[model samples]
Target: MENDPNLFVALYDFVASGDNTLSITKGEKLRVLGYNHNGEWCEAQTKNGQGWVPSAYITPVNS
Candidate 1:
C-alpha cells in the first residue's frame, strides 16, 4: 500500500508549530499519504491536516 494512505500509529508525542509538522499525540492513528524520494520524511493526513512527519516516529499499524 505504498503511498496509499497506509494506516500508522504514533509511537510518541510530537509537538510542532508549522505546516510541515503533524503535531500528533502518542498512539494517534493516521494515514501516510506519501514520502520524499529519500524516504526519511513521510506526508501524513490526520484529523487536523496533512503534514510531513519523521518516518521513524510512526510504526506500521500491524507491526
Candidate 2:
C-alpha cells in the first residue's frame, strides 16, 4: 500500500549516477516519499525502489 504521497512528475531525464540517486524519465510520475532537508533532493517511490532524486527535475502534480 502507498502512503499519502506528494505526487510529482519528472520534467527531464535523470539517470542514476550513484547508489543514492534514482533514475527518472520525462513525464514519469513519482510519489514523493521524503525530502533531504537541504531542499535540493527528494526521495521518490518507484516500482521497486525508493531513492533520492534531484528536486529541480521534478514538479508537483496539479492533480
Candidate 3:
C-alpha cells in the first residue's frame, strides 16, 4: 500500500497482516494530506472536522 497511490481503502491483512490494526473496509477512500511518525494521534482533513486516526496507518508520502 505504501507504493500504491491509486489504491483506496485496502485491507492490510494481505501485507501488514496481523501487524496491521486498521479495520477500515475496502472501497473506503482515504483523503490523506500528510503523515506523522511520532506515534501520536495526528489530524487530517476530512468531510468532518479534523479527524484523528492512528499514525501507524499512514506513511510519509515522500518518504
Candidate 4:
C-alpha cells in the first residue's frame, strides 16, 4: 500500500482551531491514519492527540 511508512514530520506548527482538528509542532512526527477527500485535511495521530490535520503541514517519512 502507498504511504507505507504511515509516518510524517511536521513542517510547521498547526494548532487545532476547530473541532475535529489536531495540533502539531514543527519538526515533530506523527502517524497518518487516513485522508480526507478535499485533499486538505488528513487524519493524523501524535503522542499528544489525534484528529484532522492539514495535509500540507506534514511531510512523509519514507525511510
lDDT of 4 by residue, 1-63 (tens): 355588898999998988879899999989998888776878999988889999889989785
Query: How many angstroms is residue 6 displaced in model 3 relative to the true structure, after the best TM-score fit?
Result: 18
State the C-alpha lDDT per candidate.
Answer: 0.82, 0.85, 0.39, 0.87
Best by lDDT: 4
Compared with the true structure, what per-residue lDDT tens digits does model 2 show for residues 7-37?
A: 8889999999889788898998899978877
RMSD of 3: 8.4
Query: Which candidate model has the greater TM-score, 1 or 4?
Result: 4
Q: Which scores higher on lDDT, 2 or 4?
A: 4
| Candidate 2 local distance difference test against the native | 0.85
When 1 and 3 are scored with lDDT, the better candidate is 1
- Tens-place lDDT per residue, model 3, 23-47, is 3433334445444566453344433
Candidate 4 Cα outliers beyond 4 Å, as residue runs:
1-4
Number of clashing residue pairs, candidate 3: 0
lDDT at 13, model 2: 92
Q: Give the alpha carbon lDDT tens digit for every residue of 1-63 in model 1.
A: 353338988998877667677788789988988999998888888887889888888887853
**lDDT, model 2, position 31:** 90
Q: List TM-score per model, in order.
A: 0.80, 0.82, 0.33, 0.84
